[PDB]
Amino acid sequence: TLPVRLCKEIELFHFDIGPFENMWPGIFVYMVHRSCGTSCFELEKLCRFIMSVKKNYRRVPYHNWKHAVTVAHCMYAILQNNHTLFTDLERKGLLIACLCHDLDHRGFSNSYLQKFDHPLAALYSTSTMEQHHFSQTVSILQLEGHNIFSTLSSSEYEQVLEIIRKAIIATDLALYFGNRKQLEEMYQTGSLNLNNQSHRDRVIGLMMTACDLCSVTKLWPVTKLTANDIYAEFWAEGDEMKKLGIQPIPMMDRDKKDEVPQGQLGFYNAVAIPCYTTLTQILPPTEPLLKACRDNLSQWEKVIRG
Numbered sequence: 001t002l003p004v005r006l007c008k009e010i011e012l013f014h015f016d017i018g019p020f021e022n023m024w025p026g027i028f029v030y031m032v033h034r035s036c037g038t039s040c041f042e043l044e045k046l047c048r049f050i051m052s053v054k055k056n057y058r059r060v061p062y063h064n065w066k067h068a069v070t071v072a073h074c075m076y077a078i079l080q081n082n083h084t085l086f087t088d089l090e091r092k093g094l095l096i097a098c099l100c101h102d103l104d105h106r107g108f109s110n111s112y113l114q115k116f117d118h119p120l121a122a123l124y125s126t127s128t129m130e131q132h133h134f135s136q137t138v139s140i141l142q143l144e145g146h147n148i149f150s151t152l153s154s155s156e157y158e159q160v161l162e163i164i165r166k167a168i169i170a171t172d173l174a175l176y177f178g179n180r181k182q183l184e185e186m187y188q189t190g191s192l193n194l195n196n197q198s199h200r201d202r203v204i205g206l207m208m209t210a211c212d213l214c215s216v217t218k219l220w221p222v223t224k225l226t227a228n229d230i231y232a233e234f235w236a237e238g239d240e241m242k243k244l245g246i247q248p249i250p251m252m253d254r255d256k257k258d259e260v261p262q263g264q265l266g267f268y269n270a271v272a273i274p275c276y277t278t279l280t281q282i283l284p285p286t287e288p289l290l291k292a293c294r295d296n297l298s299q300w301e302k303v304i305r306g
């Protein structure tokens with residue numbers, strides 16, 4: 001039973017879940033209930049699944065429960081504004097996939113795991129944590145009384161995994177660049193085809209990147225505050241590198257906080273802005289994401305300038 005006041009306020013793209021930690025796992029069911037129905041999943045299964053997912057978000061600074069829900073929300077906003085375009089399955093999974101996209105995150109980029117032969121880089125040669133976030137996803141699903149897609153036909157089943165799986169791998173920011181430069185061409189050549197499955201996959205994947213970065217798309221106090229937590233997990237990875245001798249990259253160096261505003265500026269102009277741009281080119285209604293990103297770009301600009 002969520003409060004009625006927010007009912008309208010959560011449908012906004014700039015909605016921030018921060019002030020409502022109490023409510024985060026309700027909000028999900030809320031967003032699930034509004035998109036796909038109340039008769040989507042067996043109600044009791046769906047709450048089990050959710051808090052188990054919650055339990056399996058480490059107490060990391062950034063890639064933690066709050067983040068899974070914020071992303072989760074941003075996927076909600078996009079699908080509420082693109083009603084017509086997404087199968088009923090996709091929707092379901094895309095919100096599930098979003099809530100689970102970062103399961104059991106340690107606070108460490110793939111490069112950390114792969115420069116230090118972590119087992120995960122042994123299992124997952126590439127896209128290391130994502131292949132793992134899907135792994136964790138399956139396992140919690142295969143908890144008894146947690147499988148919510150038991151409702152489906154085995155051929156609808158295997159399809160909600162393959163959506164879920166691709167969207168989880170697509171949050172691998174290293175794969176984003178190809179995806180979005182590839183979608184830029186397909187747009188510019190008139191060769192985008194919503195009926196083409198792989199074409200849908202790329203679009204889903206860009207939606208997953210826009211969702212995953214959506215902290216850049218909030219109001220400036222929300223956005224600046226979330227930035228504190230992004231570097232607290234970055235710089236932490238930096239720490240473990242000096243202890244191991246290698247000076248970490250600038251992104252991850254507590255001794256270079258002062259260069260952070262300009263680094264934000266360059267992340268926006270090379271990752272954030274291209275992503276919501278192609279997002280708006282393909283899905284026109286998603287443009288308040290782009291517009292909020294631009295507002296925050298000005299801010300980091302205005303911060304660099306004094």
Ligand SMILES: Cc1ccc2c(c1)nc(/C=C/c1cccc3cccnc13)n2-c1cccc(OCCCN2CCN(C)CC2)c1
Binds near residue numbers: 213252
């Ligand atoms: C001092 C300093 C220097 C560079 C900084 C920096 C600070 N902060 C960033 C980016 C903050 C960032 C990174 C990831 C997700 C956010 C979400 C919201 C806000 N910010 C951020 N960057 C930055 C931004 C983009 C790229 C970059 O270096 C080029 C490498 C590109 N990477 C980017 C991501 N990796 C995993 C794969 C490809 C550096």
Ligand SMILES: [Mg+2]
Binds near residue numbers: 063101102171
């Ligand atoms: Mg992730």
Ligand SMILES: [Zn+2]
Binds near residue numbers: 063071102171212
């Ligand atoms: Zn994420």
